[PDB]
A paper describes a structure:
Cystic fibrosis, is a life-threatening autosomal recessive genetic disorder that originates from mutations in the [name] ([name]) gene. The most prevalent mutation is the deletion of a phenylalanine residue at position 508 (F508del) within the first nucleotide-binding domain ([name]). Although it functions as an ion channel, [name] belongs to the ATP-binding cassette (ABC) transporter superfamily from a structural and evolutionary standpoint. We report here the development of nanobodies against [name] of human [name], characterize their interaction with the target, and demonstrate the ability of several of them to thermally stabilize [name] by 10 °C or more.
In some cases, in situ limited proteolysis using papain or subtilisin A was required to generate diffracting crystals. For example, in the 2PT-[name]-[name]-T4, papain cleavage at position K447 of 2PT-[name] led to the crystallization of a fragment of 2PT-[name] missing residues 389–447 and no electron density was observed for the likely flexible C terminal segment 638–646 and the loop 479–483 from the ABCβ subdomain. Nanobodies D12, [name], and T27 recognize the same epitope located on the edge of the α/β-core region, including the first residues of the Walker A motif and the last residues of the Walker B. In addition, a hydrogen bond is observed between an Asp found at the tip of the CDR1 of nanobodies D12 and [name] and the backbone amides of G550 and G551 (slight differences are seen between the different solved structures). Although nanobodies T4 and T8 share no sequence similarity in CDR3, the crystal structures revealed that they bind [name] in the same location, a groove which includes the γ-phosphate switch loop/Q-loop with an overall binding interface of over 900 Å2. R57 in T4 (R58 in T8) makes a hydrogen bond with the backbone carbonyl of R560 and importantly also with the backbone carbonyl of F508. F508 is nestled inside a hydrophobic pocket formed by residues located between the second framework β-strand and CDR2, namely P47, L50, A60 and the Cβ of R58 in the case of T8, while for T4 the pocket is made up of L47, V50, A59, backbone atoms of V48 and Y48 as well as the Cβ of R57. Moreover, while F508 is completely solvent exposed in the isolated [name] domain, it becomes completely buried in the [name]-ICL interface observed in the cryo-EM structures (and thus not available for the nanobodies), while our data have demonstrated that interaction with F508 is strictly required for binding by T4 or T8.
Residue numbers in the entry:
A (entry chain A): 449 to 477, 485 to 638
B (entry chain C): 1 to 120
C (entry chain B): 1 to 118
The structure:
Amino acid sequence: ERGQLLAVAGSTGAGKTSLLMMIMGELEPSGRISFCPQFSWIMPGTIKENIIFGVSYDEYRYRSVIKACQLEEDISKFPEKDNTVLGEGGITLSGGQRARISLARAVYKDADLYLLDSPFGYLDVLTEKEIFESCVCKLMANKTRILVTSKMEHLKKADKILILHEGSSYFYGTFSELQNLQP
Amino acid sequence: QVQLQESGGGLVQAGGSLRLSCAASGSIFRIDAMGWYRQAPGKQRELVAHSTSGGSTDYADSVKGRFTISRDNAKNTVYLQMNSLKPEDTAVYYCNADVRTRWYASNNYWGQGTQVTVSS
Amino acid sequence: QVQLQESGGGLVQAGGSLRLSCAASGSTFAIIAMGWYRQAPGKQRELVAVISTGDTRYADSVKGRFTISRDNAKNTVYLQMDSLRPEDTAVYYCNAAVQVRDYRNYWGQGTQVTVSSA
C-alpha cells in the first residue's frame, strides 16, 4: 500500500464532522502525518512562510510545490512575490488562492502519510483538474496518499478506492473491480 | 444520463441586467458543484462563478459585485443574475455541474452554452 | 465575532518554564487555526507555533522547548514554554483564523514574557 493513492468516497462526512477530522481528532496528541483540511487558513506573515513554516527548507521542493499547486502565476504578479505579507495588515487572498496555499503547506511537509480531506472543494473545475493531476498524481506519485473525494474522475485515477456506507458496509478495491460488481 | 439545459441569455444594452438559468435533467441523485464559465471568441474557457452544495460562492475578480450565483436544489437549477453588464463581458456562458447518478460520487457535465451579447 | 485574551506571562529565570493561555470568546466554533507570536520592542510579530486539527508547527528557534496544545472544552490554546532563555523576552500574542461564511484572522491583546539570566 506504500506510495499509493487511496480515494475515499461515500459517507465520508462534511466540515468539522468529516470522517478525517474525527480520525485526526481521535489521534490528537507512530510515523509522521500531513493533514490537509477542507477549509483553508493562513496566519499573518509571508506567502513563503505560510507554506514552509515548521519544516526544513528545500529550494527544489518549495518551487516544485508552488508549480504543482498552481501558485507560480499568482505569486509572480505580487510586487513582493512570495515575500508578500498576508492578512488584515497585508494582502487579502481569494478562497481559491488560500485553498492552494493550504494544499501546498500539506504537500511541502515531509510525511509518511498524507490525509487530504476534500481540498479542491472551493476550486473551479479547471483549477481542480490541473492541481489533482500535477500535484496528487504527478508530484506526490511516490507518497502514501489518502484523498477524500466525491468525484468519479478521482476514483478512476486512484490505485485503490474505498466506498463508505452510513452503516458498517463498504467496498474496498479498484475502480474497474467496482464496475464489474453488479453492472 | 444527465443533460444540462440553459436559458436567460440574449442581447442587453450595456448597463442592463440579465438572469441566466441552467436546470439538470436525468437520473440525478443530488448536485454538488455548479458554476458558470465563459468563453469570448479569441479567448479560452474561464471561470465567472463557482457555487458549492453548502452555499459557498466564489467569483472571478472581473465579475465581482456585478454578477451573483444562486441555485435551487429542488428545481435542480443554477442561476447567474448578472447586473450592470459591460462590453468585455460579452461571450458565451457555460453551465457546469458535478452530478451524482450514483449516490457516492459525481460526474462532470458542461452545458451547450448560451450567447450573451452587449449593445451600444 | 472572535475575542482573544492572553494570560500566563511573567518574569522567570533562564531554564525555567511558563504556560501561556489564549482564551477564545464569541464565535469560537469557527476557529480553524491558532498561532502564537512574539514581539520584541520596535520589532515585528514573529510566528512561534501554530495549531489546527491535524497539525502543530514550531519555529526552528523554539523546537524541542515549546509545545502548542489546546483544550476545546475551555476554548483555550496553550503554549508550554520550557528551558527559557533571555531571547524569549517578548510580548506573546495569539492569532485565530476564522471561517464563518467569510474568512479572516483576529489578534489577541498580548502577555509580557520576561526571562532573566541565571
